[PDB]
């Protein structure tokens, strides 16, 4: 059931998962939790979420804790301030340390705690 965009395929989980046991079930198939690295892959991804929160590949990294992609894409504090949910990230409770798609919406992004259990978005290149 892995869905084609752009280069890629993506496993739009059934099972809810925290954000890291959601990881390590994307790197067992050979993939990460989603990047997003454009409005376009942004709106296929809040799209095909069709309301429901998904957990993304969003999480700190660092001791300034800056935002980072777990499939190790740069993350762009540019490009990207756009896709968050007005407000956000707010690092509610000091403990939000992990990032997923919320809002059927451009700004779609939220952070909650690693914790929490969510569905979840796998992403793998397509390699011919
Ligand atoms: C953990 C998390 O996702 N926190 C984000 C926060 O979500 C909370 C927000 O959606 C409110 C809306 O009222 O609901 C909270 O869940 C509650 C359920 O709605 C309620 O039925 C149940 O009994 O209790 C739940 C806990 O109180 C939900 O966690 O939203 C903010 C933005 O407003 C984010 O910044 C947080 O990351
Ligand atoms: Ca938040």
């Not at 084609?4 to 998962?17: A, D, E, R, T």
């Not at 809002?103 to 569905?119: R, V």
Request: charged share 20%.
């Amino acid at each position: 059931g892995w869905k084609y965009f752009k280069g890629n395929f993506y496993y739009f989980s059934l099972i809810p998962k925290t954000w890291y046991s959601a990881e390590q079930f994307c790197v067992s198939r050979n993939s990460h939790l989603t990047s997003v690295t454009s409005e376009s892959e942004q709106e296929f991804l809040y799209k095909t979420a069709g309301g429901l929160i998904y957990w993304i590949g969003l999480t700190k990294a660092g001791m300034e804790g800056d935002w980072s992609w777990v499939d190790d894409t740069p993350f762009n504090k540019v490009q990207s301030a756009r896709f968050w949910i007005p407000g956000e990230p707010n690092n509610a409770g000091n403990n939000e340390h992990c990032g997923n798609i919320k809002a059927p919406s451009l700004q779609a992004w939220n952070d909650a705690p690693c914790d929490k259990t969510f569905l979840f978005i796998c992403k793998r290149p397509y390699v011919p």
